[PDB]
Amino acid sequence: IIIATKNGKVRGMNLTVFGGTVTAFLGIPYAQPPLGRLRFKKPQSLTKWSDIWNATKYANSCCQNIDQSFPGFHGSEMWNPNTDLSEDCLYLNVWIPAPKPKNATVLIWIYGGGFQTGTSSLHVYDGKFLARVERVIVVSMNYRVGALGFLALPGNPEAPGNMGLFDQQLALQWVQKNIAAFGGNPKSVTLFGESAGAASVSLHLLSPGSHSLFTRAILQSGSFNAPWAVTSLYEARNRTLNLAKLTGCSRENETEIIKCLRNKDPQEILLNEAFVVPYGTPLSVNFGPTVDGDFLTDMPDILLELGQFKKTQILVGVNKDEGTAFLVYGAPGFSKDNNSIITRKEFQEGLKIFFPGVSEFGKESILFHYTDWVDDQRPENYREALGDVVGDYNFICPALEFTKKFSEWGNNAFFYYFEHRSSKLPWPEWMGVMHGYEIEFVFGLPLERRDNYTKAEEILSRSIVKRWANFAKYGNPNETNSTSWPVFKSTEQKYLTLNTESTRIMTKLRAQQCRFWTSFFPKV
Amino acid sequence: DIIIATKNGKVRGMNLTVFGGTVTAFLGIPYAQPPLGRLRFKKPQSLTKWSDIWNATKYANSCCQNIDQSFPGFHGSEMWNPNTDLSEDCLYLNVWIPAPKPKNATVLIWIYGGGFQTGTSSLHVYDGKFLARVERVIVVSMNYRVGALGFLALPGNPEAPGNMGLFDQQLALQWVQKNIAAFGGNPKSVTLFGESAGAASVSLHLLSPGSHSLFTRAILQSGSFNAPWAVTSLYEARNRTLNLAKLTGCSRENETEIIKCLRNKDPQEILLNEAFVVPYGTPLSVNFGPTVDGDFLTDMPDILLELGQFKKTQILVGVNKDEGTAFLVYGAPGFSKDNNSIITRKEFQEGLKIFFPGVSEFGKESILFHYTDWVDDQRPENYREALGDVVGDYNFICPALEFTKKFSEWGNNAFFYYFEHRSSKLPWPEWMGVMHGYEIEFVFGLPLERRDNYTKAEEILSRSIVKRWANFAKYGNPNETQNNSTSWPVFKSTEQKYLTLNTESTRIMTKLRAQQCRFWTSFFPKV
Ligand SMILES: COCCN(C[C@@H]1CCCN(C2Cc3ccccc3C2)C1)C(=O)c1cc([N+](=O)[O-])c2cccnc2c1O
Ligand SMILES: COCCN(C[C@@H]1CCCN(C2Cc3ccccc3C2)C1)C(=O)c1cc([N+](=O)[O-])c2cccnc2c1O
Ligand SMILES: *[C@@H]1O[C@H](CO)[C@@H](O[C@@H]2O[C@H](CO)[C@@H](O)[C@H](O)[C@H]2NC(C)=O)[C@H](O)[C@H]1NC(C)=O
Ligand SMILES: *[C@@H]1O[C@H](CO)[C@@H](O[C@@H]2O[C@H](CO)[C@@H](O)[C@H](O)[C@H]2NC(C)=O)[C@H](O)[C@H]1NC(C)=O
Ligand SMILES: *[C@@H]1O[C@H](CO)[C@@H](O[C@@H]2O[C@H](CO)[C@@H](O)[C@H](O)[C@H]2NC(C)=O)[C@H](O)[C@H]1NC(C)=O
Ligand SMILES: *[C@H]1O[C@H](CO)[C@@H](O[C@@H]2O[C@H](CO)[C@@H](O)[C@H](O)[C@H]2NC(C)=O)[C@H](O)[C@H]1NC(C)=O
Ligand SMILES: *[C@@H]1O[C@H](CO)[C@@H](O)[C@H](O)[C@H]1NC(C)=O
Ligand SMILES: *[C@@H]1O[C@H](CO)[C@@H](O)[C@H](O)[C@H]1NC(C)=O
Ligand SMILES: *[C@@H]1O[C@H](CO)[C@@H](O)[C@H](O)[C@H]1NC(C)=O
Ligand SMILES: *[C@@H]1O[C@H](CO)[C@@H](O)[C@H](O)[C@H]1NC(C)=O
Numbered sequence A: 001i002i003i004a005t006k007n008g009k010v011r012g013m014n015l016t017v018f019g020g021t022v023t024a025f026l027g028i029p030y031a032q033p034p035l036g037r038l039r040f041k042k043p044q045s046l047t048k049w050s051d052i053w054n055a056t057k058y059a060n061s062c063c064q065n066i067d068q069s070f071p072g073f074h075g076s077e078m079w080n081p082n083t084d085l086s087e088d089c090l091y092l093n094v095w096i097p098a099p100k101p102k103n104a105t106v107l108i109w110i111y112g113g114g115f116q117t118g119t120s121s122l123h124v125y126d127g128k129f130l131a132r133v134e135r136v137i138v139v140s141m142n143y144r145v146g147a148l149g150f151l152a153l154p155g156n157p158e159a160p161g162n163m164g165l166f167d168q169q170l171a172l173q174w175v176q177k178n179i180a181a182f183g184g185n186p187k188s189v190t191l192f193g194e195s196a197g198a199a200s201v202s203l204h205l206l207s208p209g210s211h212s213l214f215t216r217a218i219l220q221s222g223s224f225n226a227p228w229a230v231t232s233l234y235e236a237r238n239r240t241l242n243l244a245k246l247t248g249c250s251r252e253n254e255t256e257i258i259k260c261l262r263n264k265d266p267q268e269i270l271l272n273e274a275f276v277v278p279y280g281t282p283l284s285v286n287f288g289p290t291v292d293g294d295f296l297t298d299m300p301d302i303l304l305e306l307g308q309f310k311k312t313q314i315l316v317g318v319n320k321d322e323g324t325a326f327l328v329y330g331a332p333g334f335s336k337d338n339n340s341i342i343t344r345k346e347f348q349e350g351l352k353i354f355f356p357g358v359s360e361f362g363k364e365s366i367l368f369h370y371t372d373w374v375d376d377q378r379p380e381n382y383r384e385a386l387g388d389v390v391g392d393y394n395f396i397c398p399a400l401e402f403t404k405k406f407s408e409w410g411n412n413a414f415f416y417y418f419e420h421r422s423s424k425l426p427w428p429e430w431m432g433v434m435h436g437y438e439i440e441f442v443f444g445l446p447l448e449r450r451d452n453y454t455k456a457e458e459i460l461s462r463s464i465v466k467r468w469a470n471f472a473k474y475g476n477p478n479e480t481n482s483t484s485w486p487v488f489k490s491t492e493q494k495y496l497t498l499n500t501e502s503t504r505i506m507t508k509l510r511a512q513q514c515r516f517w518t519s520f521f522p523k524v
Numbered sequence B: 001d002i003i004i005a006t007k008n009g010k011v012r013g014m015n016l017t018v019f020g021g022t023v024t025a026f027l028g029i030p031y032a033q034p035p036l037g038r039l040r041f042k043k044p045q046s047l048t049k050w051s052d053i054w055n056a057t058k059y060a061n062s063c064c065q066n067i068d069q070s071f072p073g074f075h076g077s078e079m080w081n082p083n084t085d086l087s088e089d090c091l092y093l094n095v096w097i098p099a100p101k102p103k104n105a106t107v108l109i110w111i112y113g114g115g116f117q118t119g120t121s122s123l124h125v126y127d128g129k130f131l132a133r134v135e136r137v138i139v140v141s142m143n144y145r146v147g148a149l150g151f152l153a154l155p156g157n158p159e160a161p162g163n164m165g166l167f168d169q170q171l172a173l174q175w176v177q178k179n180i181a182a183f184g185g186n187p188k189s190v191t192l193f194g195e196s197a198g199a200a201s202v203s204l205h206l207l208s209p210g211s212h213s214l215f216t217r218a219i220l221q222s223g224s225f226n227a228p229w230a231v232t233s234l235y236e237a238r239n240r241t242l243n244l245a246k247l248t249g250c251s252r253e254n255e256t257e258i259i260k261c262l263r264n265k266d267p268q269e270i271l272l273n274e275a276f277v278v279p280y281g282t283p284l285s286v287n288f289g290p291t292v293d294g295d296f297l298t299d300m301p302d303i304l305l306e307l308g309q310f311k312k313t314q315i316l317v318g319v320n321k322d323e324g325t326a327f328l329v330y331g332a333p334g335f336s337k338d339n340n341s342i343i344t345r346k347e348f349q350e351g352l353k354i355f356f357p358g359v360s361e362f363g364k365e366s367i368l369f370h371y372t373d374w375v376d377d378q379r380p381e382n383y384r385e386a387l388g389d390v391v392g393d394y395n396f397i398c399p400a401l402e403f404t405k406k407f408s409e410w411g412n413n414a415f416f417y418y419f420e421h422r423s424s425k426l427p428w429p430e431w432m433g434v435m436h437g438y439e440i441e442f443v444f445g446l447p448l449e450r451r452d453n454y455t456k457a458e459e460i461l462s463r464s465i466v467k468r469w470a471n472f473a474k475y476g477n478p479n480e481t482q483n484n485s486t487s488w489p490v491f492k493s494t495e496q497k498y499l500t501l502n503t504e505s506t507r508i509m510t511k512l513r514a515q516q517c518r519f520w521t522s523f524f525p526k527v
């Protein structure tokens, strides 16, 4: 099994998937390894290789800090990289159905994290099911995370910012120039990603360089207008200097600061990343996208409001309990080992952790808007209240807002609200429908009947899988005897719920809560 | 001839013709020494006796007060202006009695509203003859001193201790205790009722130990003491007295001379300086009102209320739908009685600055936020109705619901009503809605006069309210009839049930405007 790429040949492997076969290529390199003097620089193009590259194993994962908060716990360790870490990590994966097609539509995955972690080789990102069941080609790449991917000295090509974004862009360029040889259609390419990946996707809509490299976009629990998504030009600079000071690299010329940083062991850069910002929360993006004047020629909010982006169809949505995951990593009184009931004042110190710079007036206005109880007793009210605060502000409200303004320019947008909790979800029952736990359903994992998912979950997974694939192909997320999914329009603003019971059409998702974040919190 | 022997001498009345029957009325019985000369600013002095027969056949003087002349010739405003001569000699009261004379009639006592600055018991809408004819109750109403003449305060100084007007009310209540039996009344069945400042005065009599043996039950219409305008702190009363002294050229070193100086000023110069003792000044300002005097009020009313130190008895409480509207046309920009008064977002914002002078710019945006979750964006009346509801909820509805909640918690039956009908004869524009004060004519049974151009529905409604009010007084329960009538349930802190009052359908409901009152009770104190 061998395919001819424009930089040399690559050998794949056959996978057995539901009585059929999927042709998979794991670990095709798409750029020069960013080592030594190439550290912190935009990815450089590759030269041809004479012999055969064996793409039969997942490549290295990009350098990153590892979540070791809960040793032995699957809930956290399932997100930890499952291959060796290395600065040599610019590779991608390609899955193809068997037999092979002539012009299949292509789905490209951009993994999530806080831009600090993640890799394409995770079990939940396995594209072989998607290749078998809907006969699409599935691509996923590794991109640089943390300071190695997003360190910024604006105007200076030695570390300009958004390197990790340019990695993604280079992988998309690779698909354009190579995917036809695999039987793919470069004129029908759909990006999708979760959280930071979804925000990465939304950034590709803004950036001129990415205009011609894909067709449509899917944004799961993320967008660039999320409060955590983009760092100001000034706060990025403050973090680069904090990092240099912490690494014994403080200088006067910055050209020499970068020189010093290039001599540091990767671990010394990684292990200091947490300290570059004082108000460190688990939602902190220490090094993420910034306005570099290259990938982002201007402030994202401005570009969105002026409508200077790629005009195309989008699929957008969020989970029911996006906030809970972040509460167990710092907020007081919360644990995965108890029911995590908290008191009015525990709620208050929580708000102080997630809103460090906000006045006590503002942390009271917030407390106000989220205590108009339906039931006075509970006592779980506050534990769910703080959850909803984080979730609404960090994920749900920015997403509705992004979808509203994107639709305003005459493009079809579709919005979803994912309400089902996995029967195998390793976290406690109070955390609900968590950040990131729609991903296994999008990748068709419950289709594996030997895998301890319920029948109801397989049916649901099949719907999402079908809808996602049809959206990629046709621009409309329809199924087969299935609820018709309507466009999100700024007037009526309809969205679809996804659960095992009854998939309904509804309106004005959490419009009351999002009212506060969009039209009052900015004035505090 | 019509003559009753009171403990201060004999008094002569008159016969009135009311609905084919007769009502005996005694108008202008004096209940205290005229607060004249050196008696100015002092608690009312008891009456001695008169040898002859006092002729109670005309309304007495109204107490000194400024007159509303914003709209000369306009009935809507001038109907509240006094209809007798003004004078410091005003401590008189009125008595209406059914005929034939009763044996042990229940007595309803009316305390008029205002900002504690105006008002009088002789208004057309305060006519007790209908109530006496239709429900066979005895109706009593008194005049009490208003403005600085009634509430000027130098706390601890018997020359002007504060709350004189409240003590005026209280002495009239003593008069009823001592004399009403001679008219055929039951002094052990006495019910206070009043509107606004009258309602606030009523709620204070529940607090004040001195009044506790002087009445049985209470009715509060559009007012209570916990309203932001109702009660002035001990220091703010003193500072206003001094501001007044400075404004009139009466500043001294001892207080005895300031009072001695203020006593020589013409009643009119004190009146013209009342508005200036408070720096900001809105149409809701109570320049001189009740204060904590250490006599009538031994502590801040909220403390006594929270501690349960009040008279334990039944109460009837309620408010109107558009309490705020009346005050917007007397100062808020863009508003007029001659337009539909549709306003813009920023007119709304400058309006807010008029009614909340001491509040941060943050708070004036918080209010705006809580009150702009529009159902229909346009709807151009949105902001005009938003501001009305702000003033109304903050000043009347929420403090009333709050009072009723806290009062009910100590185990007495409270009933709450919500008055929603606009009068077919209301002289104000339609956008002002169900205004402050325009339930009074329905409570006094005015639409029962068929010669007066009210709708039939309105007579039905009035007759209903009159029945409930009188039944509350007699039995402690505002029932209409046992059958073919909506059950009016007690207000409890849990369900918070209230009754709506209108021509269409009187229904039982819960948690009146709970979302709005939430903001005022649990967020506004934190701004
Ligand atoms: C959906 O994926 C599930 C795994 N998570 C979500 C978890 C949330 C709580 C924190 N932990 C772990 C990560 C880690 C790494 C080393 C040591 C300790 C910890 C704590 C991850 C991510 O990859 C992830 C991570 C960040 N961040 O680093 O701040 C985000 C920031 C803004 C928006 N989205 C983010 C996001 O989605
Ligand atoms: C049910 O009464 C119907 C008539 N009004 C209500 C009108 C409202 C608009 C203002 N005018 C004033 C204007 C003005 C100027 C010069 C001389 C006389 C007047 C009359 C009265 C009152 O008697 C009355 C009055 C005040 N106050 O004067 O501050 C209240 C304060 C707090 C709570 N309630 C109050 C209240 O109910
Ligand atoms: C008027 O009615 C009252 C009752 O409200 C009569 O009452 C006194 O009433 C109390 C109970 O309320 C009794 O304990 C007393 O014994 C009563 N006193 C007397 C002398 O009977 C009162 O008598 C009635 N007055 C009349 C009918 O003239
Ligand atoms: C007491 O009354 C005074 C007099 O109005 C209030 O006023 C301020 O400060 C001085 C008083 O010494 C005046 O000259 C100013 O004009 C007043 N300020 C304004 C903005 O008018 C004072 O606030 C009151 N204080 C108390 C404790 O009651
Ligand atoms: C309204 O309801 C009250 C119940 O609270 C009725 O009260 C009774 O009235 C009779 C005389 O009419 C008294 O002898 C009883 O003592 C009262 N019962 C009490 C106080 O519990 C009242 O009659 C009802 N009236 C109408 C018109 O329905
Ligand atoms: C009992 O009294 C009710 C009043 O509460 C009367 O019903 C009303 O009838 C008049 C016309 O006769 C209508 O204008 C009202 O709208 C009716 N009110 C209702 C239905 O609530 C009637 O006298 C009696 N009704 C019954 C059902 O016995
Ligand atoms: C394996 O690869 C061969 C070609 O080498 C191909 O014919 C076959 O379909 C693939 N899958 C299986 C079943 O081995
Ligand atoms: C590539 O795969 C082939 C067949 O499995 C194997 O013989 C060879 O060692 C691998 N590496 C290279 C460089 O060919
Ligand atoms: C930067 O500093 C280095 C050594 O400190 C020096 O050689 C170089 O000329 C400097 N470059 C600029 C542009 O200042
Ligand atoms: C499914 O769950 C069972 C326990 O009932 C476990 O033994 C097995 O390893 C699980 N299989 C997978 C694929 O997770």
Ligand SMILES: *[C@@H]1O[C@H](CO)[C@@H](O)[C@H](O)[C@H]1NC(C)=O
Pocket (backbone or CB within 6 Å): A470, A474, A476, A478, A479, A480
């Ligand atoms: C879904 O919608 C597309 C729109 O082109 C249509 O072609 C198709 O028949 C529908 N159903 C399925 C299962 O694709």
Ligand SMILES: *[C@H]1O[C@H](CO)[C@@H](O)[C@H](O)[C@H]1NC(C)=O
Pocket (backbone or CB within 6 Å): A332, A333, A334, A335, A337, A338, A339, A340, A341, A342
């Ligand atoms: C459990 O979590 C920690 C103990 O590890 C503690 O702070 C908290 O009080 C506990 N939660 C509950 C609900 O008891």
Ligand SMILES: *[C@H]1O[C@H](CO)[C@@H](O)[C@H](O)[C@H]1NC(C)=O
Pocket (backbone or CB within 6 Å): B001, B002, B015, B022, B099, B100
């Ligand atoms: C009216 O009062 C009574 C009747 O109840 C009696 O004195 C006479 O009929 C009338 N009195 C008058 C008008 O002098």
Ligand SMILES: *[C@H]1O[C@H](CO)[C@@H](O)[C@H](O)[C@H]1NC(C)=O
Pocket (backbone or CB within 6 Å): B334, B335, B336, B338, B339, B340, B341, B342, B343
């Ligand atoms: C109407 O009231 C007066 C003029 O009669 C004026 O102050 C105000 O601007 C007018 N407003 C509207 C909306 O007519």
Ligand SMILES: [Cl-]
Pocket (backbone or CB within 6 Å): A227, A228, A230, A231, A284, A285, A286
């Ligand atoms: Cl940030």
Ligand SMILES: [Cl-]
Pocket (backbone or CB within 6 Å): B019, B133, B134
């Ligand atoms: Cl009659």
Ligand SMILES: [Cl-]
Pocket (backbone or CB within 6 Å): B340, B381, B430, B431
């Ligand atoms: Cl209108």
Ligand SMILES: [Cl-]
Pocket (backbone or CB within 6 Å): B478, B479, B480, B485, B486, B487, B488, B489
């Ligand atoms: Cl009843």
